[PDB]
Design a protein around this nucleic acid. Sequence first.
RNA 1: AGACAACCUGGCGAACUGAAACAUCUUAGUAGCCAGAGGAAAAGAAAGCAAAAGCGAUUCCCGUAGUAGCGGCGAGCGAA
RNA 2: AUCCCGUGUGAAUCAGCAAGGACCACCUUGCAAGGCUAAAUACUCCUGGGUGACCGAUAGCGAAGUAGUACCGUGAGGGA
RNA 3: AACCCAGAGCUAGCUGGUUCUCCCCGAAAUGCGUUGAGGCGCAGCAGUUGACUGGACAUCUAGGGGUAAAGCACUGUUUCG
RNA 4: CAGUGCCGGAAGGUCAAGGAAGUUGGUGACCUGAUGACAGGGGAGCCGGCGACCGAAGCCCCGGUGAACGGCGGCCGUAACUAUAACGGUCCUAAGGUAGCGAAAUUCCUUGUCGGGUAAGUUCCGACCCGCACGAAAGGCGUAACGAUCUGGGCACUGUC
RNA 5: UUACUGUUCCCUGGGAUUGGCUUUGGGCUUUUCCUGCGCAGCUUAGGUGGAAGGCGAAGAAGGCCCCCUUCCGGGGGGGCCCGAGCCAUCAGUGAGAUACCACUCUGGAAGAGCUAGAAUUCUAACCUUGUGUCAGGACCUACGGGCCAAGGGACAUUCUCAGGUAGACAGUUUCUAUGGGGCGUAGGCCUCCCAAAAGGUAACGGAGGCGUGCAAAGGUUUCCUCGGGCCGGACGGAGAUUGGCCCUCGAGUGCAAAGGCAGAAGGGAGCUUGACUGCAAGACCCACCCGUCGAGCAGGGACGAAAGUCGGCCUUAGUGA
Lengths: 60, 48
Amino acid sequence: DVRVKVILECTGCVRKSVNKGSRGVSRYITQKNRHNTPSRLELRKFCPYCYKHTIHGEIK
Amino acid sequence: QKKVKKIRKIILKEDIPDLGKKGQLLDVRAGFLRNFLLPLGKAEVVTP
RNA sequence: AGACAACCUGGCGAACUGAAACAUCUUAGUAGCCAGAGGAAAAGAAAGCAAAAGCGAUUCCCGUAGUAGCGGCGAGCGAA
RNA sequence: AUCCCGUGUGAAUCAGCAAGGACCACCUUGCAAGGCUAAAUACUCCUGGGUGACCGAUAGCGAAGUAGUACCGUGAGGGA
RNA sequence: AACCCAGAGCUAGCUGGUUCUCCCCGAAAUGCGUUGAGGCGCAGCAGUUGACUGGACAUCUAGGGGUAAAGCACUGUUUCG
RNA sequence: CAGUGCCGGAAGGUCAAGGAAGUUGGUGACCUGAUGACAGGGGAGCCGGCGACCGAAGCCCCGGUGAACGGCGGCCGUAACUAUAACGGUCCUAAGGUAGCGAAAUUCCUUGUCGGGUAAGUUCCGACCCGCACGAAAGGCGUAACGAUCUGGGCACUGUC
RNA sequence: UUACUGUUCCCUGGGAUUGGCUUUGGGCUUUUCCUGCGCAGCUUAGGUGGAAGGCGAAGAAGGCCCCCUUCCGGGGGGGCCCGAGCCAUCAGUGAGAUACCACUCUGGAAGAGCUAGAAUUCUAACCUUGUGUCAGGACCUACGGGCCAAGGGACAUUCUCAGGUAGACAGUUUCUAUGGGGCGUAGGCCUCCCAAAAGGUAACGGAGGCGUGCAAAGGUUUCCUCGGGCCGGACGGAGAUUGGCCCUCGAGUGCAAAGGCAGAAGGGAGCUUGACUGCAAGACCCACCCGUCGAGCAGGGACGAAAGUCGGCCUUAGUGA
Ligand SMILES: [Mg+2]
Ligand SMILES: [Mg+2]
Ligand SMILES: [Mg+2]
Ligand SMILES: [Mg+2]
Ligand SMILES: [Mg+2]
Ligand SMILES: [Mg+2]
Ligand SMILES: [Mg+2]
Ligand SMILES: [Mg+2]
Ligand SMILES: [Mg+2]
Ligand SMILES: [Mg+2]
Ligand SMILES: [Mg+2]
Ligand SMILES: [Mg+2]
Ligand SMILES: [Mg+2]
Ligand SMILES: [Mg+2]
Ligand SMILES: [Mg+2]
Ligand SMILES: [Mg+2]
Ligand SMILES: [Mg+2]
Ligand SMILES: [Mg+2]
Ligand SMILES: [Mg+2]
Ligand SMILES: [Mg+2]
Ligand SMILES: [Mg+2]
Ligand SMILES: [Mg+2]
Ligand SMILES: [Mg+2]
Ligand SMILES: [Mg+2]
Ligand SMILES: [Mg+2]
Ligand SMILES: [Mg+2]
Ligand SMILES: [Mg+2]
Ligand SMILES: [Mg+2]
Ligand SMILES: [Mg+2]
Ligand SMILES: [Mg+2]
Ligand SMILES: [Mg+2]
Ligand SMILES: [Mg+2]
Ligand SMILES: [Mg+2]
Ligand SMILES: [Mg+2]
Ligand SMILES: [Mg+2]
Ligand SMILES: [Mg+2]
Ligand SMILES: [Mg+2]
Ligand SMILES: [Mg+2]
Ligand SMILES: [Mg+2]
Ligand SMILES: [Mg+2]
Ligand SMILES: [Mg+2]
Ligand SMILES: [Mg+2]
Ligand SMILES: [Mg+2]
Ligand SMILES: [Mg+2]
Ligand SMILES: [Mg+2]
Ligand SMILES: [Mg+2]
Ligand SMILES: [Mg+2]
Ligand SMILES: [Mg+2]
Ligand SMILES: [Mg+2]
Ligand SMILES: [Mg+2]
Ligand SMILES: [Mg+2]
Ligand SMILES: [Mg+2]
Ligand SMILES: [Mg+2]
Ligand SMILES: [Mg+2]
Ligand SMILES: [Mg+2]
Ligand SMILES: [Mg+2]
Ligand SMILES: [Mg+2]
Ligand SMILES: [Mg+2]
Ligand SMILES: [Mg+2]
Ligand SMILES: [Mg+2]
Ligand SMILES: [Mg+2]
Ligand SMILES: [Mg+2]
Ligand SMILES: [Mg+2]
Ligand SMILES: [Mg+2]
Ligand SMILES: [Mg+2]
Ligand SMILES: [Mg+2]
Ligand SMILES: [Mg+2]
Ligand SMILES: [Mg+2]
Ligand SMILES: [Mg+2]
Ligand SMILES: [Mg+2]
Ligand SMILES: [Mg+2]
Ligand SMILES: [Mg+2]
Ligand SMILES: [Mg+2]
Ligand SMILES: [Mg+2]
Ligand SMILES: [Mg+2]
Ligand SMILES: [Mg+2]
Ligand SMILES: [Mg+2]
Ligand SMILES: [Mg+2]
Ligand SMILES: [Mg+2]
Ligand SMILES: [Mg+2]
Ligand SMILES: [Mg+2]
Ligand SMILES: [Mg+2]
Ligand SMILES: [Mg+2]
Ligand SMILES: [Mg+2]
Ligand SMILES: [Mg+2]
Ligand SMILES: [Mg+2]
Ligand SMILES: [Mg+2]
Ligand SMILES: [Mg+2]
Ligand SMILES: [Mg+2]
Ligand SMILES: [Mg+2]
Ligand SMILES: [Zn+2]
């Protein structure tokens, strides 16, 4: 309503089916208050595929 | 489904209005052919 | 032409019931009715199975198997 | 998918057509839109033999004697 | 919402009934869920059968607690000064 | 004449099957890639999804129609003495119960109050209106005749007592 | 019955039965013609190509007028008059000459074409009548048969598909506890009491809440102390900001209540994303299904000088097999 399920997604993940050991597109999920903060949330979070802490943006 | 205009190819044995002279080749709707021309001897349906 | 116990083939074709209610589903293409023919009827001589190896019209029994599946993926149904 | 029907459209002939569980390619298998055919299987109003850890008159068939009788019911039917 | 026959021995978590003897052991009427409440599922508590066990009845010590009593240190309440 | 029904209307919105421009996917004769046990593009054909636009009635929309379904209110304040309210204010509706009747087969409180009939009347008759909750074709109010009708009283008559 | 799901009567569209001629007309076309104010300018620069050749007596420039479009700047164009010119790299301009020519786009026109839609007819399908007329051994003013005629007519009917639509009809559903009536209320979770000092525990017993919220109200490093009295101080007052003494946990903690928590779990500041991936010994709670706590290990990080802390939130509600 004013509080929402938002999907965080790795920016450096290539959906094309990569050639490395573990292929897949990291997404986390979390909640945001779409009124308070209209800024698309950016968060550094761990990616099981890239193995490094990457940056996860949002999805529409 | 979709209505498909039925086409009968015929030869006229007598002269009739809008159609033409005797001994003439044409293409017609099935209704016109079997309900009007054919009972009166006027046309002949052709498949050689 | 009519008669004819059950069996059989075709035609119409339920409901109680089960699902702890009920509507899809189940009961069941059962009962019942109608018509038909026989000592049996029906089916039947691959426009079929199968799988890279092969079979060689139909029917019936054992098995595969309560398996694969179907299913308000419920009650249940259920092959080859 | 295969199979079979209402309404409407509507092909191809072996250089084809169909099937292999949407569909396409390849390969395998088969030849729809004409018919007919015995046996193995189902049944008991019955017929002839046989057996019975079946009954013995409240049993066994409803019925060991006028038994579908007497009687009851307008009738279908019930029924000793 | 006729009657007779048939499906039909319909269905009845309901009521009634359920037949010889002796021996041993022997409950429950609680909790949870339920279109459930007079039904049922599991648990609790029978019987019989195995496998491990060493307890029970007493005796003393140790733990934590916030009841009875008590109190006004807090929270209320209350009388008069 | 708001709600509902029914009838009439045709401008706009909505509107199925079905058509249908057009895109889109699978396959694939082939074309290239590639230190992995393969992969990426693709003509014609065949097959599949999507589909702008066209697409009636109906509905939304506009009008009529109560002997069609039905409905017909509150709150205040005011007059030579107490009083009452013809008259005003306000509220809310589609509109606020007119004529006639009224303690009624309708009246709760209630055996209302008054009058009559009785020595004495919760019934009966007439009237008041404060109609819990009358009312106009689910008809309203009258009414001569009629009734094995319901209900009150009287003369005659009697073992009803 | 304005409960649910449907069926039927009935209405309306496609298809079929089902045809001919004519119109009118919505959307596409087949030749072919109309039509374009970036600015530098001969001036309302159509993109792309052939591109030094074209347009003329099958009769142009130039003025006299008719028409239509219109941003009244000007453009296409009919008649007449006129009689030897309008022209190209000529320099501008991303793009070239109104010298010409090909597929075409912005919208318009016209005769020609597809499909409806619509209206109008026509007659042969189809429908409807007939004491009209034939007909067998004899009738059929006995139904009907053949022929003829009359009225309708591609409508209607019938079939199929689709939308609408009648409790007319069919099958069914309509909880539990209220006070074992209506009626509204209650049904899950959390805190307190009842609850008898482990845990658990009923009543239509007594009190209340929840169906979320925070990108910081999370993580971390580091610093701080609230409230209440009394006193001073311009407005300023009981109460705002400031100074000071006394009491010491009485404030706060997103929101109920309970239990916690003072150099703090309360207030502030700096940097962040651990509101991680992979897990997990063992415990608690337990009919089952769920539910809760978690040392420890690896990866890749945040903060911090480092030790270390960090798998959301002081805890317990904020949920659904
Ligand atoms: Mg056709
Ligand atoms: Mg016979
Ligand atoms: Mg017979
Ligand atoms: Mg026979
Ligand atoms: Mg049933
Ligand atoms: Mg039933
Ligand atoms: Mg049942
Ligand atoms: Mg049941
Ligand atoms: Mg035989
Ligand atoms: Mg045979
Ligand atoms: Mg053979
Ligand atoms: Mg053969
Ligand atoms: Mg086949
Ligand atoms: Mg097969
Ligand atoms: Mg069939
Ligand atoms: Mg067909
Ligand atoms: Mg052929
Ligand atoms: Mg096929
Ligand atoms: Mg084959
Ligand atoms: Mg053949
Ligand atoms: Mg076939
Ligand atoms: Mg054959
Ligand atoms: Mg045969
Ligand atoms: Mg005897
Ligand atoms: Mg006997
Ligand atoms: Mg005896
Ligand atoms: Mg009955
Ligand atoms: Mg039985
Ligand atoms: Mg049965
Ligand atoms: Mg029952
Ligand atoms: Mg004992
Ligand atoms: Mg006890
Ligand atoms: Mg019960
Ligand atoms: Mg039990
Ligand atoms: Mg035991
Ligand atoms: Mg102690
Ligand atoms: Mg102690
Ligand atoms: Mg203490
Ligand atoms: Mg005490
Ligand atoms: Mg005391
Ligand atoms: Mg005290
Ligand atoms: Mg005190
Ligand atoms: Mg109205
Ligand atoms: Mg109206
Ligand atoms: Mg109106
Ligand atoms: Mg209307
Ligand atoms: Mg419409
Ligand atoms: Mg469509
Ligand atoms: Mg197309
Ligand atoms: Mg493709
Ligand atoms: Mg390939
Ligand atoms: Mg491909
Ligand atoms: Mg439309
Ligand atoms: Mg009226
Ligand atoms: Mg009275
Ligand atoms: Mg009274
Ligand atoms: Mg009186
Ligand atoms: Mg009396
Ligand atoms: Mg009176
Ligand atoms: Mg009244
Ligand atoms: Mg009234
Ligand atoms: Mg009345
Ligand atoms: Mg009256
Ligand atoms: Mg009325
Ligand atoms: Mg009356
Ligand atoms: Mg009268
Ligand atoms: Mg009478
Ligand atoms: Mg139709
Ligand atoms: Mg038609
Ligand atoms: Mg005619
Ligand atoms: Mg006649
Ligand atoms: Mg006749
Ligand atoms: Mg006419
Ligand atoms: Mg028609
Ligand atoms: Mg329909
Ligand atoms: Mg009903
Ligand atoms: Mg309905
Ligand atoms: Mg306590
Ligand atoms: Mg205790
Ligand atoms: Mg306790
Ligand atoms: Mg309780
Ligand atoms: Mg912080
Ligand atoms: Mg609080
Ligand atoms: Mg507290
Ligand atoms: Mg802090
Ligand atoms: Mg840890
Ligand atoms: Mg460690
Ligand atoms: Mg680590
Ligand atoms: Mg560092
Ligand atoms: Mg915190
Ligand atoms: Zn990634």
